[PDB]
Amino acid sequence: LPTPHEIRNHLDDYVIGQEQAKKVLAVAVYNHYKRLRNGDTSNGVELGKSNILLIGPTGSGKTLLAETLARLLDVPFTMADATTLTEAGYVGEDVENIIQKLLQKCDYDVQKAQRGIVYIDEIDKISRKSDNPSITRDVSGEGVQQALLKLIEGTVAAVPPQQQEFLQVDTSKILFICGGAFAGLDKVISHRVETGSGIGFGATVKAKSDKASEGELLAQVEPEDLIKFGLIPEFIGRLPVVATLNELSEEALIQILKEPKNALTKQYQALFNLEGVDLEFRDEALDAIAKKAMARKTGARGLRSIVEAALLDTMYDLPSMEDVEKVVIDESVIDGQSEPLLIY
Amino acid sequence: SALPTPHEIRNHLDDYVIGQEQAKKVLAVAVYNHYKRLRNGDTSNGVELGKSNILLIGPTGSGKTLLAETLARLLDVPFTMADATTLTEAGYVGEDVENIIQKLLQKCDYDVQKAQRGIVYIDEIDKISRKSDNPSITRDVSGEGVQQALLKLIEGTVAAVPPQGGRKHPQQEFLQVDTSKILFICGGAFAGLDKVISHRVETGSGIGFGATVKAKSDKASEGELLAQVEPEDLIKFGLIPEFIGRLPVVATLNELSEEALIQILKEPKNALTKQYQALFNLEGVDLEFRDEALDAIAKKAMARKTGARGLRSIVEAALLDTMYDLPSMEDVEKVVIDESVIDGQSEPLLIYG
Ligand SMILES: Nc1ncnc2c1ncn2[C@@H]1O[C@H](COP(=O)(O)OP(=O)(O)OP(O)(O)=S)[C@@H](O)[C@H]1O
Ligand SMILES: Nc1ncnc2c1ncn2[C@@H]1O[C@H](COP(=O)(O)OP(=O)(O)OP(O)(O)=S)[C@@H](O)[C@H]1O
Ligand SMILES: [Mg+2]
Ligand SMILES: [Mg+2]
């Protein structure tokens, strides 16, 4: 019987920050459990479902939230690509593949599948760039969206085996969570509340808002902006809950190095201990690597590349070296000007 | 037999649907006629009674799908719901048009006789429409192809429904089902149809000095255009002329106004406000919505342009913080939400008892 606070604490153990989005997923999961426990509600009232939509830059942890949250979930869970889907009548993979994919973790059971949770990533890619029907029916941006319109609410869909039974499974009680890096969307929101004046004299010129981070603009996202981005109004309606993330800053990246349980620093420490050596990272060293990552715009994913190169030489001669007790990493080795300290 | 009269059946529909009078009467008349034709199965009189398919056109969140669900409850005949997007032209991986009848058989317990007198609802019918360049120099299977295959099925034909799908899989005598008495109701939100209607009813002019109409920006809303819908406009949208003909009666909805949203919040049997109240009751805390608060959410929902679905996001966002801390906090017996909480200027009010 987990509660919103309990779910929040468990999620914070793996991913830090993103408090705004953490409350959205925690409350949604708690509400889902209550509905599953009591469907009729003993009052003749049918409880609906509220789908979520995640809008954040790449490397912000959108997929990390679903993976970590999946462990706590006690119901079947699955992930989707959103890029391999195709409209009915075309090669590839129909949208129905999401439902059957969930059955993989539910031992192919309809009863348990109806109470599962489905998460789709990379939803931004499936969007009509032209914002209107093209000369030929799009099979990746518009075709997939139309099929998903009716698949997000009820619409009992067949489940092709793995021979033609096509067992029916209800999708009315299956919560749907969406998420994707809507590239360029930040500009759509800005243009809506950026300028509303003319050019020549006699115009109510308005001062442009000071430089605002991408996270601030996304915080003001509304369905109108999504429509102009290439999302049909029907699809937006299916996703009432809207949450946005914030780009990681210098302080956020430094925290991700130690605070997370599965942080890259902890993983490397255990790796060295496997062969019989201990590794430690100085506070200054962590700050240097974090700053370098943002300089190259590589993001959070780059933290693993910088550290790998810095310790590449040490790991080459680490197991071969004998009579070694500890390894010290400072700020002078991040830039490569000084060889990492080693004691015997 | 005690066949429900159109007025009685319409009253039940009002319980789950609000702000819809033209569509409720059309559906009530067609369903009532369906029962009458069932009694006269042998058509004692020389003249044989036919069927009149319906077509629903309206914006998103207008109650097109909700009407089919609520009506299916009263319909004693097997009722089925199908998606036009999944359907494709025959001979392809996508589901064929014959699958519609297959699903109906399951609802009737493999009873072919009962399948003859049935009602189907092809939701998202507007999806299968000729896109730009109606001629379609290329072969279209998920668009015009579906409409062509639906010409004989909607009008009525003997389709050899496969005997699989929950029954004996091996090859056997394919069941013969006649769709000459199945009332087909197509419903979908034809996006962009309003623009085509305006180009016809509303006269347009270019640039000039005399005999030119400026046509100021402030004109009739798109709702009025949808009301005066002509089959010619539908053909220009992408529907083949032979397809629109199968649907003689066409009922159009109207965009929900501010007053309509308020009624939908309480009057419906399963309303948005009542759903949240029950959710809070499970943990042991009551929920109440002030009259002024309902007005604020309704007004803010209209600007969303997402139909009735907008109310779901407005109430969820306002109560996002309430539900996140309510279970953790104890000694809570009720929550009061006023107008000052909808706009977010003041946090939700709570009383400890
Ligand atoms: N806030 C964060 N805290 C800790 N680690 C993070 C965070 N954000 C990203 N990471 C790390 O970055 C890795 C990849 O990030 P993702 O979860 O893929 O974010 P993403 O934006 O969803 O990527 P996509 O889906 O390809 S756009 C994760 O496995 C984490 O190790
Ligand atoms: N007339 C109405 N009365 C009460 N609730 C309504 C009404 N219209 C819409 N709703 C609400 O909106 C929800 C969605 O209804 P739908 O009919 O499925 O929307 P829709 O218009 O069918 O979407 P499209 O256009 O088919 S994609 C319902 O479950 C109700 O909660
Ligand atoms: Mg991802
Ligand atoms: Mg619908």
Automatic annotation (TrEMBL), chain B:
Recorded GO MF terms: ATP binding; ATP hydrolysis activity; ATP-dependent protein folding chaperone; peptidase activity; protein dimerization activity; unfolded protein binding; zinc ion binding
Amino-acid positions noted as binding ATP in the UniProt annotation, renumbered to this chain: 59-66
Zinc among keywords: yes
Keyword Endoplasmic reticulum among UniProt keywords: no
UniProt keyword list: ATP-binding, Chaperone, Hydrolase, Metal-binding, Nucleotide-binding, Protease, Zinc
GO cellular component, one term: HslUV protease complex
Gene Ontology annotations of biological process type: cell division; proteolysis involved in protein catabolic process
Signal peptide as annotated in the record: none
Domain of life: Bacteria
Assembly mode: Component of the ClpX-ClpP complex. Forms a hexameric ring that, in the presence of ATP, binds to fourteen ClpP subunits assembled into a disk-like structure with a central cavity, resembling the structure of eukaryotic proteasomes.
UniProt function note: ATP-dependent specificity component of the Clp protease. It directs the protease to specific substrates. Can perform chaperone functions in the absence of ClpP.
Homology family: Belongs to the ClpX chaperone family.
Protein's name in the database: ATP-dependent Clp protease ATP-binding subunit ClpX
Gene source species: Escherichia coli
Gene designation per UniProt: clpX
